[PDB]
Amino acid sequence: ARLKTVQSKVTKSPRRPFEKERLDQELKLIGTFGLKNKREVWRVKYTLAKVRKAARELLTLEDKDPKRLFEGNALLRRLVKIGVLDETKMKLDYVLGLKVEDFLERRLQTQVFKLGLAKSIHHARILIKQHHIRVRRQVVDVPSFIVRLDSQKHIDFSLQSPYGGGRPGRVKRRTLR
Amino acid sequence: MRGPKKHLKRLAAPSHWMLDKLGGVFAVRPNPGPHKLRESLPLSLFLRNRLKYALNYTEAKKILTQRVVRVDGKVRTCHKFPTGFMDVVAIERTNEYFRMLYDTKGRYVVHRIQAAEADFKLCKVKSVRTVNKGVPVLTTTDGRTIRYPDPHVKVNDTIVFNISTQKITDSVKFEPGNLAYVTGGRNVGRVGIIGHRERLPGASDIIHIKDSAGHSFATRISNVFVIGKGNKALVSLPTGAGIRLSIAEERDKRM
Amino acid sequence: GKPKGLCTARKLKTHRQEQRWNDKRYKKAHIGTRWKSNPFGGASHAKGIVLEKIGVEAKQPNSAIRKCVRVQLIKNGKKITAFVPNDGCLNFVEENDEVLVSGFGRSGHAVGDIPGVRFKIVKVANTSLIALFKGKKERP
Amino acid sequence: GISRDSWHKRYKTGATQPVPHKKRKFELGRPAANTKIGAHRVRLVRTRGGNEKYRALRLDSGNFSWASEQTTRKTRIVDTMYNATNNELVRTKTLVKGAIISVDAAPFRQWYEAHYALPLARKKNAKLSEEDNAILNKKRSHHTMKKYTERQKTAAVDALLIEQFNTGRLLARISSSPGQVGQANGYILEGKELDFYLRKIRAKKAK
RNA sequence: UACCUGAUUGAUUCUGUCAGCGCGAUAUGCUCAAGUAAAAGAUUAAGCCAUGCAUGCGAUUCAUUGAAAUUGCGUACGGCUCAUUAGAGCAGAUAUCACCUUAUCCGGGAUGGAUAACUGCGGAAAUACUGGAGCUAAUACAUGCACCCCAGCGGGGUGCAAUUAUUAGUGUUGACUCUGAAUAAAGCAGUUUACUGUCAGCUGACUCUAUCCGGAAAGGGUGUCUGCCCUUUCAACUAGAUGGUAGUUUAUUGGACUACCAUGGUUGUUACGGGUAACGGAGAAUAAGGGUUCGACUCCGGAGAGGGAGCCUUAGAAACGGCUACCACGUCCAAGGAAGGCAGCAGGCGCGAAACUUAUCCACUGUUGUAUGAGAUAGUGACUAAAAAUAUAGUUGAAUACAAAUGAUUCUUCGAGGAGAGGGCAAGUCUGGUGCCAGCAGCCGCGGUAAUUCCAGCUCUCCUAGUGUAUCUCGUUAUUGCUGCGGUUAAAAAGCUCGUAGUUGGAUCUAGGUUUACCUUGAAUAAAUCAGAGUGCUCAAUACAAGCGCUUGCUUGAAUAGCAUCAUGGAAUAAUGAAAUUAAUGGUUAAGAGGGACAA
RNA sequence: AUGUCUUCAUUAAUCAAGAACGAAAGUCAGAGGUUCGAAGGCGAUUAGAUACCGCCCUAGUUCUGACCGUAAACGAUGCCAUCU
RNA sequence: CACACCGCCCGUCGCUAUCCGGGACUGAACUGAUUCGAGAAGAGUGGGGACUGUGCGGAAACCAUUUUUAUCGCAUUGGUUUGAACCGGGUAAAAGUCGUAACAAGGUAGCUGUAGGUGAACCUGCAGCUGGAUCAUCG
RNA sequence: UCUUAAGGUAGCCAAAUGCCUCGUCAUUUAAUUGUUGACGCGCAUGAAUGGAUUAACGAGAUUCCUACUGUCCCUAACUAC
RNA sequence: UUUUUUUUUU
């Protein structure tokens, strides 16, 4: 009958629940990039850990190994398209140099306020929540949505949102009536 | 069990059929016939996936009940008919002719052919024997038996079989230097020139084949299918000419 | 020293198996009488009936009377002593009550200054002891 | 019922074997035919796959073969003489493959005389009966007599066989399984085989 | 991310465990904005079950299109569960020259009599109970339409399959008592279309039905090699047991069984016995590497249908939504009799720490395709996985979707809790009560009238729609150590020696100028899962898609990686063999190994 | 052990099962029984003194033939080879 | 020993709680095997011939026997669980009784094996060990 | 504390030895002054006046289970003398 | 020559 459904975890808990250094460093990451909870930062840590581990495992191999070649260019390609790796810095010895801040910057929430669409990062988030941003003619409502390089310059207000042309919001309509 | 099995779970279906995992619990179970279950394709699947002429499995049956599909010159109305390697499928209404061939990966494709090609097919001589009344016959790998063949035809050879006249036209001999197709194993879908033959007496002989790109590969004789004399193929081949592109070469070609 | 030859796999494997039995954890997990000896029979909790309320003198250097209760388990009829945690919670437990009992935390060993008690009460009359203590729920 | 399963036996080492399942149909057995000498009686058995077997319970006529002469005649089973397996089968007149029996010699004598046009150890003082004369003293053209003259060249018959023909009962051996095919076809003993079985029979009679 | 921290002492360094700490499974406490996927009476009781469903659809149509009934086909697949089971079962390779097959593929082969529906007469309290009387059909039932011998004038026999025997050697396979060709009888019971609808023009062409023979395919039965749990408080076991001959049975081989005969067969390289809270595998959890633990459960194989046993029908069953009996336990009786098998779906009772609606449909995947509790939908659902609101949801009517719905998606009306706060370990020596009491406290320890530890208020800390507790697995753990532990005193060298199995064994044969073992490379090697390539499901977990023009279309992806067997090459290392008419005729050296001799 | 220009030529190391030896005490049988001496009995000491101290002693201590197979049977260190 | 000799500490006895062992009772219960006795039902065979087709045929009940063999009886045996008068061991538990065994030469150095004795720790004999209170004592 | 030459040791027990006594508890039975196992301040057990065990043996004393039966319920018939 | 003990927690 029905088969097993595939599920995966995207977060790994820290080995030490209480260390002041880690707690401060993670709270600062929540601060700069407006996040919701520690799971939000552990998710990025986990993705970065996967990337770094894959790079290390490939680098254990010599330069012209078939697997090394294929997987290395694939990984570098994905990172470039996300905008996390430097398009001149095409190597795994250099992909083993990234930080959680690189990934956290490419989030839609950060770009919304970085490009001026919103004042504060919290403003960016509540706009993305209330469906006032669109990407390449698509209303994205996920503050964690990553912005590819191509999508970087094609993000503006929704064509419907009252701040992008549309029926006035509830407050305005109440006042008008 | 207590008797023959009539179902075939989707996950148990052959991988090379390339069915989708979440597309129901069952898959069309081919009927017994010319081709083996693992090395065949239901006529229902041919229309459902490879040709897209039918949206669902009621529509496949609706199409096939009209008596519009011919396999090897005979009309087939059963949606579970096991079409297999080097089978001529003719849809007269749309004037379309295909030959069921293997892709380099090892999957069935849609190879459109012309009437001249469709008039014949190749078969591998599986046995040469003498039936009652002392008359010679040869049995192919697709179940066909042909009476009164040329006495020079031996096992493992290829015979050109004319669908219209139901007669043998030519015989290509399984010897070094002839073009050969690989139907089974991990080298399925590859075409090359037969090379050395390791003669294992009580087991399956081993055949080394070198393609046009210079790549060599071995296989078992039961997976080799001669498709021409020297280097000339008696039938056409799908885009690729049985050349196994490497994984890097595939990406480079795509880009 | 241990054998090191290239053909001593059997000796190494057999010796490892022989010596694994001298390990408390392995023997405790494979002895065979675990189910018949453990009062819960390998379960985490068990329902039982309260027989009486007893007081256990705390070990030294502490001094107190821990309010425990004697319980008879329904599944096998074995008698155990369970601790009633929290302050004044022995009042909630009446005689001839159906109580859910759980382990005390150390896998069948006494905890703290309470001697010989390896179980604690979780529910009484199908009501959570914590809920009763916090006032969330009341005695049925 | 009767089973042919390999389990229920001990192992090579003498260990008791585990029973894998309940008795399966495809490993069944059936009661033995135990064919006897008597009026023809053959029952039909439905076997696996819809096929059929012929369980012969009683048989009297056997379609036996003379190998040296390369012929086959239908004679009648008279009595059972020797059985390698067990003497009880001989004493109860059981027709089983490989059993030595006594069959009528007259059909073979008739064939011999009609084929070579010569007597087969005919009696030394008795005139041939009319039916014999119809095939022995028959008169046909020399064209046909040429064929018989050619065949008379190779006509010597072994003395041990002639002695049996004198008694009129021939020692034969059953070469079929009456319980499976429903017939008792066999062949006439001759040569070293005949000497062997004759010596066995005579020794057992002497004892 | 190849990691540790607290606790024995007045203090110190160790051994060593306990405790902490991370993940997962199950249960459970408290608590839960909307949505999306999705596990779910396995654990104990393969315990017991009220009631509904879960298997039905060419020939024969004098009923009213097609009912009823007779045929034929299917119900041996599918669904469930994991009790039994330790050369059983499974995994990989491999035979069947020892076998059996419906459905599907390829070759070859216008006869007669009776029975139902129907009419009618009845019995029983009671069954899907049935006896008589009168008709009537078939795709039911029956019948069936060049060589040998005698005699070369002429007579007979010779289809396929099949029994026995014999003859010569028309193909094959590594090899055939195989397949062909002949000869002889005989019985053998199978078979070589009295079918439906027909069409075209005496000549043609189809569909259907029936039907054997040979070869395939698919399925099955057995056979071989290698691997697969604990236990010596199990060391010897085995008597149809091991083998031979002849038979019997079977579809076939076989001590499968019988008659006679021989004395064999397994075992410290662990037989035999016992245990298993034991179905095997694919796989799952944890995870530097090496591993440890588990795997009832959607896929593959096996087994069972309350426990046994026996059988009918059939191509296929030792079938149980088939029958027959016994055992245990039920049901209805008018007491004469008649019945039952949820470990199918849904529900109920028991059992327990522990698990959902007596709902809608064949629209989807499939079953030969109207029928499908298989399958698909919706219900209950803090098992679980992903994404997200509490600041800077609800609600109305449409469309869409669907088999009908629901829900999402498009529009439009109004409109925050769980643990903690001495240390480990982030966070109060704030206030009030209580005075070794009540209580807390995983561990160390708090409390004896001035408690940062109890009970409260206020404040903080961690995580957060989740957060705690209990049991268990893995890490931690070099506290099972092959990698990789330790044995003077912390636990641990046998009192000592001899000795079989086991383990391990010195150097030495082409340097220069026959076997194995081992290594390399290939072959054979189901998916799902894991790794991994591609691809804006709005992201993600997932999924396997999709992306381009312009309409009559083109091009695509759905990769690749992941013991034993066979072959290829390599000839170090480690075993193993050769010799006690000509030619160099054939014995490595003699261990700062061992044994023996001789001296004093 | 040493000496050896003797001999054999890998016959070796360690060893589950298996076997010999194995202090003292102890057991069985037969002899001996000096000394010392468990147990026992006395005299002291003591709060008591079933002990230390003193006196008289039984088994034993000794020999022969059998058992037992244990010791702080200890260098609390297994054996073989090799280097510093 | 470190609360530092007014230290620490060992046994018997007494009270409470709890776990386990032995135990007369041919104890008891559950479960699996094996021998033997009986034996349902089916299937095979030999009879039989109600009934009905043409001296011939088909055939139901029934009878006899072979085989598979459930099931029931004793009997033996393996494995689990368990009652029991009484007799004992172990452990735990703030402030019981008796003594002083050990740690200093612990006031008789301590300990090992063995044997005997005694309320209890323990004492004594024999032979060992230093883990001793001597690394030593003059030839 | 009185006191003896010594104050009954190891064992065993309501025994063929215990008055009280049909001791008390358990076992056997529906029911037991009986049996067996325990307890022991034992009127008045006890170590070659030998103590405690003990396989095999017994026309020895005792209790129970099974088989069997006219011993009995409850008697009847038959034969020889 | 004789020379036994020292409640619980802190």
Coordinates of all heavy atoms in Angstrom, one line a residue, chain E residues 5-25:
Chain E
rU5 P 36.8 18.5 31.3 OP1 37.9 19.5 31.4 OP2 37.2 17.1 31.5 O5' 35.7 18.9 32.3 C5' 35.2 20.2 32.4 C4' 33.8 20.3 33.0 O4' 32.9 19.5 32.3 C3' 33.7 19.7 34.4 O3' 34.2 20.6 35.4 C2' 32.3 19.4 34.5 O2' 31.5 20.5 34.8 C1' 31.9 18.9 33.1 N1 32.0 17.4 33.0 C2 31.1 16.7 33.6 O2 30.2 17.1 34.3 N3 31.2 15.3 33.5 C4 32.2 14.7 32.7 O4 32.2 13.4 32.7 C5 33.1 15.5 32.1 C6 33.0 16.8 32.2
rG6 P 34.7 20.0 36.8 OP1 35.3 21.2 37.6 OP2 35.5 18.8 36.6 O5' 33.4 19.6 37.6 C5' 32.6 20.6 38.3 C4' 31.5 19.9 39.1 O4' 30.7 19.0 38.2 C3' 32.1 18.9 40.1 O3' 32.4 19.6 41.3 C2' 30.9 18.0 40.3 O2' 29.9 18.5 41.1 C1' 30.4 17.9 38.9 N9 30.9 16.7 38.2 C8 31.9 16.8 37.2 N7 32.2 15.7 36.7 C5 31.4 14.8 37.3 C6 31.3 13.4 37.2 O6 31.9 12.6 36.4 N1 30.3 12.8 38.0 C2 29.6 13.5 38.9 N2 28.7 12.9 39.7 N3 29.7 14.9 39.1 C4 30.6 15.4 38.2
rA7 P 33.6 18.9 42.3 OP1 33.7 19.8 43.4 OP2 34.7 18.5 41.4 O5' 32.9 17.6 42.8 C5' 31.8 17.6 43.6 C4' 31.3 16.2 44.0 O4' 30.8 15.6 42.8 C3' 32.4 15.3 44.5 O3' 32.7 15.5 45.9 C2' 31.8 13.9 44.2 O2' 30.8 13.6 45.2 C1' 31.1 14.2 42.9 N9 31.9 13.8 41.7 C8 32.7 14.7 41.0 N7 33.4 14.1 40.1 C5 33.0 12.8 40.1 C6 33.3 11.6 39.4 N6 34.1 11.6 38.4 N1 32.7 10.5 39.7 C2 31.8 10.4 40.8 N3 31.5 11.4 41.5 C4 32.1 12.6 41.2
rU8 P 34.2 15.6 46.4 OP1 34.3 16.8 47.3 OP2 35.1 15.6 45.2 O5' 34.4 14.3 47.2 C5' 34.3 13.0 46.6 C4' 34.4 11.9 47.6 O4' 34.6 10.7 47.0 C3' 35.7 12.0 48.5 O3' 35.3 11.5 49.8 C2' 36.7 11.1 47.9 O2' 37.7 10.6 48.7 C1' 35.7 10.0 47.4 N1 36.3 9.2 46.3 C2 36.2 7.8 46.4 O2 35.7 7.3 47.3 N3 36.8 7.2 45.3 C4 37.3 7.7 44.2 O4 37.8 7.0 43.3 C5 37.4 9.1 44.2 C6 36.9 9.8 45.2
rU9 P 35.4 12.5 51.1 OP1 35.2 11.7 52.3 OP2 34.6 13.7 50.9 O5' 37.0 12.9 51.2 C5' 37.9 12.1 51.8 C4' 39.3 12.8 51.7 O4' 39.7 13.0 50.4 C3' 39.4 14.2 52.4 O3' 39.5 14.1 53.8 C2' 40.6 14.7 51.7 O2' 41.8 14.2 52.3 C1' 40.5 14.2 50.3 N1 39.8 15.1 49.4 C2 40.6 16.1 48.7 O2 41.8 16.1 48.9 N3 39.9 16.9 47.9 C4 38.6 16.9 47.7 O4 38.1 17.8 46.9 C5 37.8 15.9 48.4 C6 38.5 15.1 49.2
rG10 P 38.6 15.2 54.7 OP1 38.8 14.8 56.1 OP2 37.3 15.3 54.1 O5' 39.4 16.6 54.4 C5' 38.9 17.7 55.1 C4' 40.0 18.8 55.1 O4' 41.1 18.5 56.0 C3' 40.7 19.0 53.7 O3' 39.9 19.8 52.8 C2' 42.0 19.6 54.1 O2' 41.9 21.0 54.3 C1' 42.3 18.9 55.4 N9 43.2 17.7 55.2 C8 42.8 16.4 55.6 N7 43.8 15.6 55.3 C5 44.8 16.3 54.8 C6 46.0 15.9 54.3 O6 46.5 14.8 54.3 N1 46.8 17.0 53.8 C2 46.3 18.3 53.8 N2 47.2 19.2 53.3 N3 45.1 18.7 54.2 C4 44.4 17.6 54.7
rA11 P 39.5 19.2 51.4 OP1 38.4 20.1 50.9 OP2 39.2 17.8 51.5 O5' 40.7 19.4 50.5 C5' 41.2 20.8 50.2 C4' 42.6 20.8 49.9 O4' 43.4 20.2 51.0 C3' 43.1 20.0 48.7 O3' 42.9 20.6 47.4 C2' 44.6 19.8 49.0 O2' 45.3 21.0 48.7 C1' 44.5 19.6 50.5 N9 44.4 18.2 50.8 C8 43.4 17.5 51.5 N7 43.7 16.2 51.6 C5 44.9 16.0 51.1 C6 45.7 14.9 50.9 N6 45.4 13.7 51.4 N1 46.9 15.1 50.4 C2 47.3 16.3 49.9 N3 46.6 17.4 50.0 C4 45.4 17.2 50.6
rU12 P 42.6 19.7 46.1 OP1 42.5 20.6 45.0 OP2 41.6 18.7 46.4 O5' 44.0 18.9 45.9 C5' 45.2 19.6 45.6 C4' 46.3 18.6 45.3 O4' 46.6 17.8 46.4 C3' 46.0 17.6 44.2 O3' 46.1 18.2 42.9 C2' 47.0 16.5 44.4 O2' 48.2 16.9 43.9 C1' 47.0 16.5 46.0 N1 46.3 15.4 46.6 C2 46.8 14.2 46.5 O2 47.8 13.9 45.9 N3 46.0 13.2 47.1 C4 44.8 13.4 47.8 O4 44.3 12.4 48.3 C5 44.4 14.7 47.8 C6 45.1 15.7 47.3
rU13 P 45.1 17.7 41.7 OP1 45.1 18.7 40.6 OP2 43.8 17.2 42.3 O5' 45.8 16.4 41.2 C5' 47.2 16.4 40.8 C4' 47.8 15.0 40.6 O4' 47.9 14.4 41.9 C3' 46.9 14.1 39.8 O3' 47.1 14.2 38.4 C2' 47.4 12.7 40.3 O2' 48.6 12.3 39.7 C1' 47.6 13.0 41.8 N1 46.5 12.6 42.7 C2 46.5 11.3 43.1 O2 47.2 10.5 42.7 N3 45.4 11.1 44.0 C4 44.5 11.9 44.4 O4 43.6 11.5 45.2 C5 44.6 13.3 44.0 C6 45.6 13.6 43.1
rC14 P 46.1 13.5 37.4 OP1 46.6 13.6 36.1 OP2 44.7 13.9 37.7 O5' 46.2 11.9 37.9 C5' 45.2 11.0 37.6 C4' 45.6 9.6 38.1 O4' 45.8 9.7 39.5 C3' 44.6 8.5 37.9 O3' 44.7 7.9 36.6 C2' 44.9 7.6 39.0 O2' 46.0 6.8 38.7 C1' 45.3 8.5 40.1 N1 44.2 8.9 41.0 C2 43.6 7.9 41.8 O2 44.0 6.8 41.8 N3 42.6 8.3 42.7 C4 42.2 9.5 42.7 N4 41.2 9.8 43.6 C5 42.8 10.5 42.0 C6 43.8 10.2 41.1
rU15 P 43.5 7.6 35.7 OP1 43.9 7.4 34.3 OP2 42.4 8.7 36.0 O5' 42.9 6.3 36.3 C5' 43.7 5.1 36.3 C4' 43.1 4.1 37.2 O4' 43.1 4.6 38.6 C3' 41.6 3.8 37.0 O3' 41.4 2.8 35.9 C2' 41.1 3.3 38.3 O2' 41.5 1.9 38.5 C1' 42.0 4.1 39.3 N1 41.2 5.3 39.8 C2 40.3 5.1 40.8 O2 40.1 4.0 41.3 N3 39.7 6.2 41.2 C4 39.9 7.5 40.8 O4 39.3 8.4 41.3 C5 40.8 7.6 39.7 C6 41.5 6.5 39.3
rG16 P 40.2 3.1 34.9 OP1 40.1 1.9 34.0 OP2 40.4 4.4 34.3 O5' 38.9 3.1 35.8 C5' 38.5 1.9 36.5 C4' 37.5 2.2 37.6 O4' 37.9 3.2 38.5 C3' 36.2 2.8 37.0 O3' 35.3 1.9 36.4 C2' 35.6 3.5 38.3 O2' 35.0 2.5 39.1 C1' 36.9 4.0 38.9 N9 37.2 5.4 38.6 C8 37.9 5.8 37.5 N7 38.0 7.1 37.4 C5 37.3 7.6 38.5 C6 37.1 8.9 38.9 O6 37.4 10.0 38.4 N1 36.3 8.9 40.1 C2 35.8 7.8 40.7 N2 35.1 8.1 41.8 N3 36.0 6.6 40.3 C4 36.8 6.6 39.2
rU17 P 34.6 2.2 35.0 OP1 34.4 0.9 34.4 OP2 35.4 3.2 34.3 O5' 33.2 2.8 35.4 C5' 32.2 2.1 35.9 C4' 31.7 2.6 37.2 O4' 32.7 3.4 37.8 C3' 30.5 3.6 37.1 O3' 29.3 2.9 37.0 C2' 30.6 4.3 38.4 O2' 30.1 3.6 39.5 C1' 32.1 4.4 38.6 N1 32.7 5.7 38.1 C2 32.5 6.8 38.8 O2 31.9 6.8 39.8 N3 33.1 8.0 38.3 C4 33.8 8.1 37.1 O4 34.3 9.1 36.8 C5 34.0 6.8 36.4 C6 33.4 5.7 36.9
rC18 P 28.1 3.6 36.0 OP1 27.1 2.5 35.7 OP2 28.8 4.2 34.8 O5' 27.4 4.7 36.8 C5' 26.7 4.3 38.0 C4' 26.5 5.5 38.9 O4' 27.8 6.1 39.3 C3' 25.8 6.7 38.3 O3' 24.4 6.6 38.2 C2' 26.3 7.9 39.2 O2' 25.6 7.9 40.4 C1' 27.7 7.5 39.4 N1 28.7 8.1 38.5 C2 29.0 9.5 38.6 O2 28.4 10.1 39.5 N3 29.8 10.0 37.7 C4 30.4 9.3 36.8 N4 31.2 9.8 35.9 C5 30.1 7.9 36.6 C6 29.3 7.4 37.5
rA19 P 23.6 7.1 37.0 OP1 22.2 6.8 37.2 OP2 24.3 6.6 35.7 O5' 23.8 8.7 37.0 C5' 23.1 9.4 38.1 C4' 23.6 10.8 38.1 O4' 25.0 10.9 38.3 C3' 23.4 11.6 36.8 O3' 22.1 12.1 36.5 C2' 24.4 12.8 37.0 O2' 23.9 13.7 37.9 C1' 25.6 12.0 37.7 N9 26.5 11.6 36.7 C8 26.8 10.4 36.2 N7 27.7 10.4 35.3 C5 28.1 11.7 35.2 C6 29.1 12.4 34.4 N6 29.9 11.8 33.6 N1 29.2 13.7 34.6 C2 28.4 14.3 35.5 N3 27.5 13.8 36.3 C4 27.4 12.5 36.1
rG20 P 21.6 12.2 35.0 OP1 20.1 12.4 35.0 OP2 22.2 11.0 34.2 O5' 22.3 13.5 34.5 C5' 22.0 14.7 35.1 C4' 23.1 15.8 34.8 O4' 24.4 15.2 35.0 C3' 23.1 16.3 33.4 O3' 22.2 17.3 33.1 C2' 24.5 16.8 33.3 O2' 24.7 18.0 33.8 C1' 25.3 15.7 34.1 N9 25.9 14.7 33.3 C8 25.6 13.3 33.3 N7 26.3 12.6 32.5 C5 27.1 13.6 31.9 C6 28.1 13.5 30.9 O6 28.5 12.4 30.3 N1 28.7 14.7 30.5 C2 28.3 15.9 31.1 N2 29.0 16.9 30.7 N3 27.4 16.0 32.1 C4 26.9 14.8 32.4
rC21 P 21.1 17.2 31.9 OP1 20.2 18.3 32.0 OP2 20.6 15.8 31.9 O5' 22.0 17.4 30.6 C5' 22.8 18.5 30.5 C4' 23.8 18.3 29.4 O4' 24.8 17.4 29.7 C3' 23.2 17.8 28.1 O3' 22.6 18.8 27.3 C2' 24.4 17.2 27.4 O2' 25.2 18.2 26.8 C1' 25.2 16.6 28.6 N1 24.9 15.2 28.8 C2 25.3 14.3 27.8 O2 25.9 14.7 26.8 N3 25.0 13.0 28.0 C4 24.4 12.6 29.1 N4 24.1 11.3 29.2 C5 23.9 13.5 30.1 C6 24.2 14.8 29.9
rG22 P 21.2 18.5 26.5 OP1 20.6 19.7 26.1 OP2 20.4 17.5 27.3 O5' 21.7 17.8 25.2 C5' 22.4 18.5 24.2 C4' 22.6 17.7 23.0 O4' 23.6 16.7 23.2 C3' 21.4 16.8 22.5 O3' 20.5 17.6 21.7 C2' 22.1 15.8 21.7 O2' 22.6 16.3 20.4 C1' 23.4 15.5 22.5 N9 23.1 14.4 23.5 C8 22.8 14.5 24.8 N7 22.6 13.4 25.4 C5 22.7 12.4 24.4 C6 22.6 11.0 24.4 O6 22.3 10.3 25.3 N1 22.8 10.5 23.1 C2 23.1 11.2 22.0 N2 23.3 10.5 20.9 N3 23.2 12.5 22.0 C4 23.0 13.1 23.2
rC23 P 18.9 17.1 21.8 OP1 18.1 18.2 21.2 OP2 18.6 16.7 23.2 O5' 18.9 15.9 20.8 C5' 19.3 16.0 19.5 C4' 19.4 14.6 18.8 O4' 20.4 13.8 19.5 C3' 18.1 13.8 18.8 O3' 17.2 14.2 17.8 C2' 18.7 12.4 18.6 O2' 19.1 12.2 17.2 C1' 20.0 12.4 19.4 N1 19.8 11.9 20.7 C2 19.6 10.5 20.9 O2 19.6 9.8 19.9 N3 19.4 10.0 22.1 C4 19.4 10.7 23.2 N4 19.2 10.2 24.3 C5 19.6 12.1 23.1 C6 19.7 12.7 21.9
rG24 P 15.6 14.1 18.1 OP1 14.9 14.8 17.0 OP2 15.4 14.5 19.5 O5' 15.3 12.5 18.0 C5' 15.5 11.9 16.8 C4' 15.4 10.4 17.0 O4' 16.4 9.9 17.9 C3' 14.1 9.8 17.6 O3' 13.1 9.7 16.7 C2' 14.6 8.5 18.2 O2' 14.6 7.5 17.2 C1' 16.0 8.8 18.7 N9 16.0 9.2 20.1 C8 16.2 10.4 20.6 N7 16.2 10.4 21.9 C5 16.0 9.1 22.3 C6 15.9 8.5 23.5 O6 16.0 9.0 24.6 N1 15.7 7.1 23.4 C2 15.6 6.4 22.2 N2 15.5 5.1 22.3 N3 15.7 7.0 21.0 C4 15.9 8.3 21.1
rA25 P 11.5 9.8 17.2 OP1 10.7 9.8 16.0 OP2 11.4 10.8 18.2 O5' 11.3 8.4 17.9 C5' 11.3 7.2 17.1 C4' 11.0 6.0 18.0 O4' 12.1 5.8 18.9 C3' 9.8 6.1 18.8 O3' 8.6 5.8 18.1 C2' 10.0 5.1 20.0 O2' 9.8 3.8 19.6 C1' 11.5 5.3 20.2 N9 11.9 6.3 21.2 C8 12.3 7.6 21.0 N7 12.5 8.2 22.1 C5 12.3 7.3 23.1 C6 12.4 7.4 24.5 N6 12.8 8.4 25.1 N1 12.1 6.3 25.2 C2 11.7 5.2 24.5 N3 11.6 5.0 23.2 C4 11.9 6.1 22.6

